[PDB]
Design a binder for this molecule. Structure first.
Ligand SMILES: Nc1nc(=O)n([C@H]2CS[C@H](COP(=O)(O)OP(=O)(O)OP(=O)(O)O)O2)cc1F
Ligand SMILES: [Mg+2]
Ligand SMILES: [Mg+2]
Lengths: 358, 983, 363
DNA sequence: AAAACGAGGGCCAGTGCCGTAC
DNA sequence: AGCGATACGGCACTGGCCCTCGTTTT
């Protein structure tokens, strides 16, 4: 709709005129991403790795090759995780059921002639005994659904579906309502040892791991989520005469922006540079609109910063050079407030840490 | 042509003054000495139209010049002396700008205090400087008090604007400002920073005190000890340079009180305003005391320094000026970055060595370490007290699944944790340093509650005394030590006993690993104590040392580090590289404060010469500014310049970090600096003081002939002639010579020449004994040389002859001693007496060397003054724009412009010539040699430096950064006459 | 050339015996271990910090791995060059400005027929022709500076000034491996040739405001192999004469180190208020510091064993939880740099770790 | 329960060696 | 009478005054 157009003028996506359709975006075919989309994706992936690093006991990060080891590119992100299985058996001391997570750029063919598309996906391969396989599969279902629910503006948009077949005993798929058509966001399968037993026969005496004085070849859980589709999901979840993207604070790429109000004076630039440094010193993404060069209107400025999903906008006028007072302006409430420049860092940090809840 | 050297002069027709017996004695002296192999190489004689002389001699020329240059200022000072003081106001006005206090101390809002002259002392809150905050100034009419904009509470942004105090009056005579350390006040003047100007000059009471009744640093050290038989008679006639002391000296009034809180340097701006009235009052006391002191000093200085040359010379010497730009800030940033990097590397390596050496604590294996056993090796674990009870021991009191139903067991463990936390806090008290680590490691760590805490062991050094022993092997030996001096180094049989006993309890001393390390070293108390290297057992004593001081630590022994002995391990070339790192940051370590804090005021595009804006340089949103060097006009000895930063400013070495500091003074576009270095002054001065005492001509001495014989251009000076003996070129030979003239001590010349040439002691000693000929000879029981023809006699009464003393042969030290015996002023020529504390009247005086040095260095400083007044005289008389001066004792550089640079250099040559002729005339004759009459080098370029071709370290590429090139001079500048119409 | 066993034993690398210097330098290695990819993660993040975040006018770019028209990309410079106009629109034509990206690249290699992939962090700096060599010198000094820190011996990393076949100036960054120097990062000054070739029609949309005039941007480029860098730091971390006593430990810089602290259980056995260890665990990971869990264990062995096991993993500190700490509240601590026992409080330990990393990042 | 004495660390100035210039 | 001289600073080290806290006291 009118969301794809404000992602072009605000650089969430790369420049296109024909391959800007919903179908081409759902496709791996690109026109990749604009800086905003890149940062959104990076924060999203950071939170993903965070939502799986807090998980007890231990999951080891790995990286797989992209091409065929014997001469070709990868479709799934499972094989590479399976190759490092026997090795990472040593590090866990073969003690308990354990997993391997990884985030990578996987490919898939897109259909004149036919081309190839890219999607950046995050996968987790969870090795667990057959008896406690299904239960852990449901566990991961819950934790993943909750994961998509945390940053969501609406939990009803995210859905979870059950299924099965002859190859997979029980599987679950995570869908996302658009609502121009509910789409696939993540797949959770319960593959047997066949996949693993196919690339190590044999003497298969290496594969079975200890399970309380018990030797047993572990059932394999295949977690596979898409972060591009997820990015688009949250983008459509944030779209709200007003045209403002209300992405989640922890997820939002740039979370604050500051300009000047008084005419182009070196001192204003000095103060703004100071605040720039102070804010970047405590890990806060800030957009420098004080460069500037003109600082035209304030309304189209706020419109620009709202279409960029900036949490707070800051204005450094000439009065700031006296009292230290500065013009704050929210996004979710758009309330024009004012406060001292020294207590800005603390307020922002506290606001970000307050959004930490599940 | 003629008389072995003279030029075409119009400085007096007569003249000889032949002295035939005298020149016969001189020629006879120079034949037996003996030098009679003349090279006969006539320098190209110069014919030019000299500027108007005012007659009769050049003495009265310079006198009239110096008087007319200092007449308005003298009048102003006289207006300060006969001034009737209006009393201090009852209360100070708390208003921005100036406030005039006239009748009954009322408040008259004024922008500029229009007075012919006034005393001054500015105040500055150091807490957020270097911006002026308070000021008080009294005038022959009334009082004035200036306040800065720091009256309103704001969040300012200091980029050093034109906020400094305004003092100069506008045109569309005239000014004089006196004060204690007047240059610091001058640096806070709004209109002193402008490229042009200025009519206003300054008078320093401190410099004046130094000129009148000053004292040496050595005299200062024992003056303050007042809290060598007749060395205490000058204790009450002079004083240290403090304001309270100099007031208690010249006024002798009640002891003025000093601020007990030091609020301007200890406190903030907040606690200043709370005590505004009082601080103002303090400033008033200061300017009042300064006024009294000045009033008492001016006539004294005028008496002791009668020649106006010194007056005007001291006037222009105070108004120095250093133009700069953004490249300064770039210089600061880059140099500081380089410094922090090298220090990061060094400290990283050292703390790495310190970390891996901390592992041999367990168990007691440190006693075997030949380097690490003197120190602590402590093991603490304190402390706790009992509060729980009673009578029970608190020291001893594989299943697979997948559960998650206990979703809130996490916050349970969390609650358990936090509840467990806030119940131990009352068990200890004050967090001490890490006890688990040995003491030597605790000391080598920053405190935990320190705002600048860095991880692991910081504070590593270089130049400490723990770390050099921590690693370094020691001169073909193993251990190094310290007690009264560190490892012995640089700056008929003898035997010494040994011993070894035990008694308990001291620290264990190993001495086997030493022997084995010696074995490992030679794998590739006696003997081996002379030239080789070894360490005994215990004792401890010298047993084969040459230095009488020691050296902690070896930080300038690179050739004795990159030749084998000595080295370090582990290991390899880490030693020489560490020493390199030290040498690189040696300058910036002891200067970074003075350089980075060195303020500078930027002037906007409104208050600058538009004739520069027209020049094809803006430059690209570039800022242009400047800084006044802030120099004490006269400091001992003799009345030279004294400045914390720019006088101790390192030269251009490709090794040092902040070595570009000298070349950062970049002249504004359209402008260029033209300067010169006297080569040489002190040597030729000593020479003249020799030949003018011996005879009438200039070459009638053994020493005074070799001086004015060599040319530095494609030739060999006297310094260069002693440097090629060999010999070491060239600064070293200079140090050897100037060291010889002021006390050529046999062991000093020994260890020095041996330090500079790097050979063996015997041949060196031979060379020294060969060169000690110059000072030889000299004079019941006594030295076997007197006025009688033989010393041996029987009961011969002659106590009336033991009053004469003087060396013989080559040198002329006898005259330098002659000026050092007179109990009366001793002022040649001109011509100013100094210090009631060094005058042999009522002083032992036992300060001979300081007085000889005073003689010749004063000749150098009077030389400086003469150069100044001369340069100023033909800079205003003619159309030479840019009169701003920048001098360093010998060298002197003027800030001119690109179109008047050659005529300015010409003015320099003129100046030098006239000054040389002055020194010649003050002793006779007016005739002067050739290869000494004119400057050999005259630098003309954008930034100031040593040579015309400059390289650097930190910016790596000099011309890579926006620079130009220099030009040597020369003989080609002798084609542009002082008249405006040239080329 | 024997620390390989330490790379296999503790997975910073693959456990395959076929890991020759060629196989690693080419990018044909089977893959890095978890500790290895975490090490490379922190190294790359430390690139991202001291290149993109701190310096303005620098924005992240997402270049694809292939071409819409088989072989892949050999460098991620081009894909960045493609995004020039839009990233000119977001900066309002205010050059100099740069685009950085850390992407894996594929190099064709003829083994004396295969293809080796290696992760590279490239930054393309669009700068006016008036200030090309100055920015080249700047980035040379700052890249070299960024690589010379973290090092236990910065003397190894060197730089080489070299010129193009045409005349374009460029600089190469070397690390001194035990078998000689090796290229790890390449800096070049491309004279706006490629951009001109990419936009033949309208050269107007390429003009960037130098200040008072719009000029054609000269293209600077710095490509840093983070794999070879990771290996370089891995070698630098490991220790060398008359030391009298040797211990196996790799001293990685505390910032890029894979596992920060290691939490264990001592004395031993003690049940069952050991749930506090879980508390310290989640508290630690909440503040983003890597903590190894020493709970389920088969050893039950000498402390020197797991101490050496943690020093082979370059773990900074070893925190020990015993029952006496369950009593009062002073856990044990053993630093890697200096092996020494030290008692400390809990929240004091958390904040000590945070301050340790934060201050290590500084001077 | 309550008064007193000794151990620990910071702020202070003095002192010894070294860094530069001219 | 015997002699390096004029300065400007820095950092490393130290013995002593002073405040705080604990070990020891009605
Ligand atoms: N050791 C020294 N003592 C000094 O008193 N001086 C100075 C005080 S002023 C005058 C200037 O000496 P310079 O350093 O410029 O050396 P110079 O001009 O006498 O000799 P040269 O021309 O520089 O070769 O003699 C120099 C020394 F090197
Ligand atoms: Mg000279
Ligand atoms: Mg000189």
């Amino acid at each position: 709709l009118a969301l794809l157009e404000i992602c072009q003028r605000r650089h969430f996506l790369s420049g296109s005129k024909q391959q800007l359709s919903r179908d081409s975006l759902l496709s791996g075919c690109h026109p990749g991403f604009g800086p905003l989309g890149v940062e959104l994706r990076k924060n999203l992936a950071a939170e993903w790795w965070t939502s799986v690093v807090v998980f007890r006991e231990q999951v080891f990060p790995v990286d797989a090759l992209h091409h065929k080891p014997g001469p070709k590119l990868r479709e799934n992100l499972l094989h590479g995780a399976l190759e490092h299985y026997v090795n990472c058996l040593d590090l866990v001391n073969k003690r308990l059921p354990y997993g391997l997570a990884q985030i990578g750029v996987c490919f898939h063919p897109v259909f004149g002639v036919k081309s190839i598309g890219e999607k950046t996906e995050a996968s987790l391969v969870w090795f667990t005994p057959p008896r406690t396989s299904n239960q852990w599969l449901d566990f991961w279902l819950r934790h993943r659904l909750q994961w998509w629910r945390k940053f969501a503006m609406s939990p009803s948009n995210f859905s979870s579906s059950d299924c099965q077949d002859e190859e997979g005993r029980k599987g679950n798929k995570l869908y996302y309502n658009f609502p121009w058509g509910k789409e696939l966001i993540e797949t959770l399968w319960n593959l047997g040892d066949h996949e693993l037993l196919h690339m190590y026969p044999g003497n298969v005496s290496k594969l079975h791991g200890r399970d309380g004085r018990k030797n047993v070849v572990p059932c394999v859980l295949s977690v596979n989520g898409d972060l591009d589709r997820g990015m688009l999901a949250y983008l459509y979840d944030s779209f709200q005469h007003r045209k403002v993207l209300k992405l989640h604070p922890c997820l939002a790429p740039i979370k604050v922006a500051l300009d000047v109000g008084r005419g182009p004076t070196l001192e204003l630039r000095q103060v703004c540079q100071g605040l720039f440094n102070e804010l970047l010193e405590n890990g806060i993404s800030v957009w420098p609109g004080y460069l500037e060069t003109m600082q035209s209107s304030l309304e189209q400025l706020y419109s620009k910063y709202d279409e960029m999903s900036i949490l707070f906008t800051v204005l450094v006028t000439e009065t700031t050079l006296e009292n230290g007072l500065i013009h704050l302006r929210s996004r979710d409430t758009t309330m024009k407030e004012m406060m001292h420049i020294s207590k800005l860092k603390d307020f922002l940090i506290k606001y970000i840490s307050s959004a930490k809840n599940v | 042509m003629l008389s072995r050297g003279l030029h075409e002069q119009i400085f007096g027709q007569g003249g000889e003054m032949p002295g035939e017996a005298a020149v016969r004695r001189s020629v006879e002296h120079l034949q037996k000495h003996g030098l009679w192999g003349q090279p006969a190489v006539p320098l190209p004689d110069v014919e030019l139209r000299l500027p108007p002389l005012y007659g009769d001699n050049l003495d009265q020329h310079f006198r009239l010049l110096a008087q007319k240059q200092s007449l308005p200022y003298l009048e102003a000072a006289n207006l300060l002396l006969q001034a009737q003081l209006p009393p201090k106001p009852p209360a100070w006005a708390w208003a921005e700008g100036w406030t005039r206090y006239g009748p009954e101390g009322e408040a008259v809002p004024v922008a500029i205090p229009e007075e012919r002259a006034l005393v001054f002392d500015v105040e500055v809150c150091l807490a957020e400087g270097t911006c002026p905050t308070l000021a008080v100034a009294i005038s022959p009419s009334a009082w004035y008090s200036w306040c800065s904009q720091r009256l309103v509470e704001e969040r300012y942004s200091w980029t050093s604007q034109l906020s400094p105090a305004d003092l100069i009056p506008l045109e569309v005579q005239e000014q004089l400002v006196v004060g204690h350390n007047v240059s610091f006040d001058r640096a806070h003047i709004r209109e002193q920073y402008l490229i042009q100007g200025s009519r206003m000059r300054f008078l320093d009471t401190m410099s004046m005190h130094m000129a009148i009744s000053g004292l040496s640093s050595f005299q200062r050290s024992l003056w303050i000890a007042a809290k060598a038989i007749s060395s205490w008679d000058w204790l009450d006639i002079s004083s240290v340079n403090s304001l309270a002391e100099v007031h208690r000296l010249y006024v002798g009034g009640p002891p003025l009180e000093k601020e007990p809180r030091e609020l301007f340097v200890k406190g903030t701006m907040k606690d200043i305003r709370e005590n505004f009235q009082d601080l103002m009052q303090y400033c008033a006391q200061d300017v009042w005391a300064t006024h009294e002191v000045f009033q008492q000093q001016l006539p004294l200085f005028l008496e002791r320094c009668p020649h106006p040359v010194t007056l005007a010379g001291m006037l222009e010497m105070g108004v120095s000026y250093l133009p700069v730009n953004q490249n300064w800030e770039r210089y600061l940033a880059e140099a500081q970055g380089t410094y922090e990097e090298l220090q990061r590397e060094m400290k990283k390596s050292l703390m790495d060595l310190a970390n891996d050496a901390c592992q041999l604590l367990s168990g007691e294996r440190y006693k075997e370490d030949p380097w690490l056993w003197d120190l602590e090796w402590d093991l603490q674990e304190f402390k706790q007290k009992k509060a729980k009870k009673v009578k029970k021991e608190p020291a001893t009191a594989l299943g697979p699944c997948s559960e998650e139903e206990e979703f809130q067991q996490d916050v349970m463990a969390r609650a358990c944790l936090q509840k467990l936390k806030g119940t131990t806090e009352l068990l200890p008290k004050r967090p001490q340093h890490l006890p688990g680590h040995p003491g030597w490691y605790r000391k080598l760590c920053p405190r935990l509650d320190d705002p600048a805490w860095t991880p692991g062991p910081s504070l590593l050094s270089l130049q400490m005394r723990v770390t050099p022993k921590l690693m370094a092997l020691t001169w073909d030996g193993f251990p190094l030590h310290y007690s009264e001096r560190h490892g012995w180094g640089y700056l008929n049989l003898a035997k010494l006993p040994t011993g070894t006993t035990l008694e308990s309890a001291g620290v264990v001393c190993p001495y086997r690993a030493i022997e084995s390390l010696y074995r490992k070293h030679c794998l590739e108390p006696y003997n081996d104590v002379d030239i080789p290297g070894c360490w005994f057992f215990k004792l401890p004593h010298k047993d084969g040392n040459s230095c009488n001081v020691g050296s902690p630590f070896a930080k300038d022994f690179l050739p004795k580090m990159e030749d084998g002995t000595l080295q370090a391990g582990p290991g390899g070339a880490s030693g020489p590289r560490a020493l390199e790192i030290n040498k690189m940051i040696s300058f910036w370590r002891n200067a970074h404060k003075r350089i980075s804090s060195q303020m500078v005021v930027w002037l906007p595009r409104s208050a600058l010469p538009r004739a520069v804006i027209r020049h094809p340089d803006y430059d690209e949103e570039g800022l242009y500014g400047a800084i006044l060097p802030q120099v004490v006009t006269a400091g001992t000895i003799t009345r030279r310049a004294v400045e914390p930063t720019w006088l101790t400013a390192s030269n251009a070495r490709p090794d040092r970090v902040g070595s570009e500091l000298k070349a950062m003074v970049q002249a504004p576009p359209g402008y260029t600096l033209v300067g010169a270095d006297v080569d040489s002054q002190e040597l030729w001065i000593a020479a003249v003081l020799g030949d003018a005492h011996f005879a009438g001509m200039h070459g009638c001495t053994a020493f005074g002939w070799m001086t004015l014989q060599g040319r530095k251009s494609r030739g060999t000076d006297l310094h260069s002639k002693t440097a090629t003996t060999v010999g070491i070129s060239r600064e070293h030979a200079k140090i050897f010579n100037y060291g010889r003239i002021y006390g050529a001590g046999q062991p000093f010349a020994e260890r020095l020449l041996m330090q500079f040439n790097h050979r063996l002691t015997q041949q060196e000693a031979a060379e020294k004994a060969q060169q000690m000929y110059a000072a030889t000879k000299g004079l019941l029981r006594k030295v076997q040389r007197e006025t009688a023809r033989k010393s041996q006699w029987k009961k011969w009464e002659v106590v009336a002859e033991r009053a004469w003393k003087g060396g013989t042969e080559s040198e002329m030290f006898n005259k330098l001693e002659s000026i050092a015996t007179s109990d009366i002023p001793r002022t040649p020529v001109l011509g100013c007496c100094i210090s009631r504390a060094l005058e042999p009247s009522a002083v032992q005086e036992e300060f001979m060397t300081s007085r000889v040095n005073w003689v010749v260095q004063s000749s150098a400083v009077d030389y400086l003054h003469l150069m100044l007044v001369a340069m100023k005289w033909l800079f205003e008389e003619f159309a030479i724009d840019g009169r701003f001066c920048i001098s360093i004792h010998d060298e002197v550089r003027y800030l001119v412009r690109e179109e008047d640079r050659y005529r300015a250099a010409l003015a320099l040559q003129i100046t030098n010539l006239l000054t040389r002729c002055m020194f010649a005339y003050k002793l006779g004759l007016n005739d002067l040699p050739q290869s000494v009459a004119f400057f050999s080098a005259v630098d003309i370029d954008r930034c100031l430096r040593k040579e015309v071709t400059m390289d650097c370290k930190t910016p790596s590429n000099p011309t890579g950064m926006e620079r130009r090139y220099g030009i040597p001079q020369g003989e080609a500048l002798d084609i542009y006459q002082i008249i405006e119409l040239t080329k």
